[PDB]
């Protein structure tokens, strides 16, 4: 196995760290590769990739509420955009710290829509998530005016050997009188007290909404998001119940039909 | 080092859904740990067919030699081998005994699936693995699989038993719900105990009760962790 293949594997592992365990996974891989130069040069991308993939929320000094690190905010040169506070900031992927906030020109013909959606979503997120954060981007892709709503929520409890994270990304492609709606909802949970058990799930959403006033549409968008996310959470709950009451039970009995543990001398006859 | 310790730590964290690819990636990353990783990283059990006896048997590292695997029924390697590692005559007789006993255990608790027991000599006794593999019938669009890997060390009037048991549990469904949902992985537990060895309480009975007690316990714990704990975590995400 070549050094190039070793570092590709190292980068892959790093990018597959479960939520809240990036440092542990990074350290393991670093000690296994045992070549800091190779790691630096061949897995440099892996830190940024992971953070943006995970919608890592970061706190900026002087601004309440946090902002999500996502591909949509990547300003290059190690800086990221906070469309709500109209700022750019430096972000260190390794130390996961923001620094050097600077006013950033955010003006756009999407400006007022991004803002109406953002204020509505922020309220939706405070209500629906215990530890939620959201970042809404307004940009033109392929000339099409698009609102990109990103939601993150996590609960890290390494001391109880578990971490979990929700991520949702909603894309509204505006084409009056109708907006095209695409979304990906994701959940990952990791439990590892004397084991390694993980829930991995995601659902793709495809839909459309009537577009009207800036304010009314925001209401429409958030209503779509709410119905979809509740539906998904409900379906997940339904799967758990079915896995518990049907599949798990059928895999192994609690006790043999005798309703007593096995008499092993008998079995040996 | 320490590389072994990190390797195991990494397998505790990388998604179990890619458990097989994880291991071979890890072997590629650190070629020198190959034997250690192959023996200490548990992997889903594979079913092979013993053409001679017309019975299924389970593949894992413990019945492997080179690229071939030993059937517990015919006691032969497939692909055939000139000098494949075999159990002594004494231990082979016990192994056949254990396979017969755990076959009935399998039927009693799992009402299906496949079982296999492989034994091997130790300095002051012997060890063995008891493997059970059971696939779900796929009802309600849920695919399920249960793997038992019970590894026992016996130090030989009375004997000391050390049991390290891993159960793997995989649940998956692709309802439009819901979208893709995968809930899987494994739990490991360990027990130790001295017990009398006698006519009425031979080694196979002693190991039997140990495996049964352990597995009943783990079944209950899987229920709590999979359907209690991970669900509670989801609900608080929320």
């Amino acid at each position: 196995v070549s050094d190039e293949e070793k570092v590709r594997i190292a980068a892959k592992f790093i990018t597959h760290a479960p939520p809240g365990e990036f440092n542990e996974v990074f350290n393991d891989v670093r000690l296994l590769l045992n070549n800091d130069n190779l790691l630096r040069e061949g897995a440099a991308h892996a830190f940024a990739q992971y953070n943006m993939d995970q919608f890592t929320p970061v706190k900026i000094e002087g601004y309440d509420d946090q902002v999500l690190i996502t591909e949509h905010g990547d300003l290059g040169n190690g800086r990221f955009l906070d469309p709500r506070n109209k700022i750019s900031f430096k972000f260190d992927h390794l130390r996961k710290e923001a620094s050097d906030p600077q006013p950033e020109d955010t003006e756009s013909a999407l400006k007022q829509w991004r803002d109406a959606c953002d204020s509505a979503l922020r309220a939706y997120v405070k209500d629906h998530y215990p530890n939620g954060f959201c970042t809404v981007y307004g940009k033109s892709i392929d000339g099409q005016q698009t609102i990109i709503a990103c939601i993150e929520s996590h609960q890290f409890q390494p001391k109880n050997f578990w971490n979990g994270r929700w991520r949702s990304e909603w894309k509204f492609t505006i084409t009056p009188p109708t907006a095209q709606v695409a979304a990906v909802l994701k959940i990952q949970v990791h439990y590892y007290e004397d084991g390694n058990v993980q829930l991995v799930s995601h659902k793709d959403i495809q839909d459309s909404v009537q577009v009207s006033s800036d304010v009314q549409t925001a209401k429409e968008f958030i209503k779509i998001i709410e119905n979809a996310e509740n539906e998904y959470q409900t379906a997940i709950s339904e799967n758990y119940q079915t896995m518990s009451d049907t599949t798990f039970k059928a895999l192994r009995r609690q006790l043999p039909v005798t309703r007593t543990k096995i008499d092993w001398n008998k079995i040996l006859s | 080092d320490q590389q072994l310790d990190c390797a195991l730590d990494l397998m505790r964290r990388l998604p179990p859904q890619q458990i097989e690819k994880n291991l071979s990636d890890l072997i590629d990353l650190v070629p020198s740990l190959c034997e250690d990783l192959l023996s200490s990283v548990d992997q889903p059990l594979k079913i092979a067919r013993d053409k001679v006896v017309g019975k299924d048997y389970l593949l894992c590292d413990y019945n492997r030699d080179g690229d071939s695997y030993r059937s517990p029924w015919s006691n032969k390697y497939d692909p055939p081998l000139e000098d494949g590692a075999m159990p002594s005559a004494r231990l082979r007789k016990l192994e056949v005994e254990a396979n017969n006993a755990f076959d009935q255990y399998r039927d009693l608790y799992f009402e299906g699936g496949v079982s296999s027991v492989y034994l091997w000599d130790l300095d002051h006794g012997f060890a063995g693995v008891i493997l059970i593999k059971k696939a779900g019938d796929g009802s309600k669009k849920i695919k399920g699989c249960w793997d038992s890997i019970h590894v026992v060390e016996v130090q030989e009037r009375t004997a000391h038993y050390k049991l390290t048991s891993t159960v793997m549990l995989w649940l998956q469904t692709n309802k439009t719900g819901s979208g893709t949902m995968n809930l899987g992985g494994s739990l490991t537990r360990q027990m130790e105990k001295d017990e009398t060895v006698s006519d009425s309480s031979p080694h196979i009975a002693n190991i039997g009760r140990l495996v049964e007690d352990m597995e009943n316990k783990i079944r209950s714990t899987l229920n709590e962790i999979y359907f209690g704990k991970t669900k509670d975590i989801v609900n608080g995400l929320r």
């Binding site: 790691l39 590892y192 | 310790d5 195991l8 505790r12 034997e35 492997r64 390290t164």
Partner: peptide
């Protein structure tokens, strides 16, 4: 950029590490 900066996996305990080993078997190719 510094890597000793990133701390730190104090490793979990590994129950499978101490199971009886069956030494002296050929590796796969």
């Amino acid at each position: 950029v510094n890597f000793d900066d990133i701390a730190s996996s104090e490793n979990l305990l590994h129950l499978t590490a101490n199971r009886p080993k069956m030494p002296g078997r050929r590796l796969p190719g």
